Amino acid sequence: LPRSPPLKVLAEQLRRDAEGGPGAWRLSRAAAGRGPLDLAAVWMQGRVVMADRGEARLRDPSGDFSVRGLERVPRGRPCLVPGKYVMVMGVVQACSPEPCLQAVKMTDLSDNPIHESMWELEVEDLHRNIP
């Protein structure tokens, strides 16, 4: 649904660097010597800490984030279980004090330990390569 791509981000980036509001979110890059990065959809990853109906709380190394609308997403290997490591493609609803996403997808990344160990590096590498 979203026009812009699902940017890889850590919770801290939304929590600390996001500006604007609904329909006009910006990631500040002033420190990195670059202009604002517009964002609507994101790719985030984390451990499921809590799940109740189509809502979940997830944890990446930088902090927690909430996900809603999970009853609507494609049904891969079930992963709405505390302890599972998962990816979410979501539309940003809120950034601070806790980032909140409306889910497009949530899928399991628990089988392969490399995903969790690579994620922080993936976010850094991607952000190094956006003008």
Next chain:
Amino acid sequence: ENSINLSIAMDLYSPPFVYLSVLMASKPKEVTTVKVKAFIVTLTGNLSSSGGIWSITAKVSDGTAYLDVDFVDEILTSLIGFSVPEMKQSKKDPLQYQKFLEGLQKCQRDLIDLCCLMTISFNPSLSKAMVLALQDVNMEHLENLKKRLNK
């Protein structure tokens, strides 16, 4: 074409993977093959057996762009567990066709859960892209990435 912009060599070919946005910004003039870490956002067409092979179209993302892709027959055969000719032979035998239906569902789940390295041939003249191979991420990829970030 007998020349390349040397300043984009790492941008297109650095391990463990590269970015679709960077590929597109380079404005390729010839078919260019890159490796990206991507997931499927959505399927965009039916699974077809036209031509006696499997095909399907999907929109993938690597976090930097969307790209509509086709998947090679061999990938889909591996995921379903039946080639098209095998599926057609199975139909007259309920127990065999049931194995195929189970494979179809397995393929569906596999494509929902897909998050891996995709080797993609992008043809800028035809605005077409074909996924040639899939690879699970491994520790060599992690080390490649750390090296790139000098960590």
